[PDB]
């Protein structure tokens, strides 16, 4: 059936710039795919919990606050989205 592979929308230069921000001087070619895997697992975890909040509230629109709460569940506190 349909190809659902949007992880591949995350581009080599985006990953390289995140690594430079993390202070990385040189990057093996194998890290790009590895990175896409870790990012997918992160996002699956967060989004699974955020839609859990949404569904519990009987809403069909995921709000920033659903995401803030889902992040807290992963042990991450995000500032700037309460307003």
């Amino acid at each position: 059936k349909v190809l659902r592979d949007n992880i591949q929308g995350i581009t080599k230069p985006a990953i390289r710039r995140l690594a430079r921000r993390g202070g990385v001087k040189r990057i093996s070619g194998l890290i790009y795919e590895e990175t896409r895997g870790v990012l997918k697992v992160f996002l699956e975890n967060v989004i699974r919990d955020a839609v859990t909040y949404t569904e519990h509230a009987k809403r069909k629109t995921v709000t920033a606050m659903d995401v803030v709460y889902a992040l807290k569940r992963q042990g991450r506190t995000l500032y700037g989205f309460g307003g």
Binding site: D49, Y53, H56, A57, M65
Partner: protein, 92 residues
Amino acid sequence: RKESYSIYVYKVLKQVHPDTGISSKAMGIMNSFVNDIFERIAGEASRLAHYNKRSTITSREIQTAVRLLLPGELAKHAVSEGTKAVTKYTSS
């Protein structure tokens, strides 16, 4: 002076392994475990009620908290077992 669940953990042990005993140290571990899981689930159900401006923790808040807190198959099986308990209680 944490809650003791020893009696009930014994009853479950006899259902699952009629054979086997349990040391008092091991029983202390099980008691810690029940209290810990109770506090995680109720603390989350309390946050859910508050987020949604509800005065009330129902079995819906408990269910959602179980889905949030438990991994994978454990969550599915615990959701099924909770749902069964509520259906049987409501019937009887």
